[PDB]
């Protein structure tokens with residue numbers, strides 16, 4: 001089914017990569033390696049969990065593992081682009097402990113699939 005188009009390795013404009021397995025059941029499971037300069041929790045793999053349906057994808061990475069804890073998480077909501085160079089256009093929300101309660105940052109990531 002469609003899951004074939006998603007499963008593999010992707011990268012964004014910041015050099016972050018993720019490896020995902022997309023299940024025919026809609027499940028998204030993988031590992032994310034963050035390389036956005038200046039941000040915490042770079043390099044080491046963090047678990048990705050998400051879902052997809054039609055052209056729409058969403059996934060979550062909680063930025064705590066055995067090597068670094070950034071007291072934050074990011075949720076991406078995206079849409080798939082088809083062939084030649086497959087693409088996922090996303091908007092993300094990063095929720096973190098701000099000092100007087102949770103805070104959120106927003107941004108956009110474009111992922112391109114590794115050939």
Ligand SMILES: O=C(O)CCCC[C@@H]1SC[C@@H]2NC(=O)N[C@@H]21
Pocket residue numbers: 012014016034035036039040041042063070071072073074092094096107109
């Ligand atoms: O600094 C943190 O709290 C954890 C690292 C967050 C990295 C962000 S998530 C959205 C954006 N896209 C990336 O690949 N890295 C940054």
Ligand SMILES: [Zn+2]
Pocket residue numbers: 001002003004024
């Ligand atoms: Zn299938």
Ligand SMILES: [Zn+2]
Pocket residue numbers: 023025027
């Ligand atoms: Zn499954």
Ligand SMILES: [Zn+2]
Pocket residue numbers: 071072097
């Ligand atoms: Zn915390």
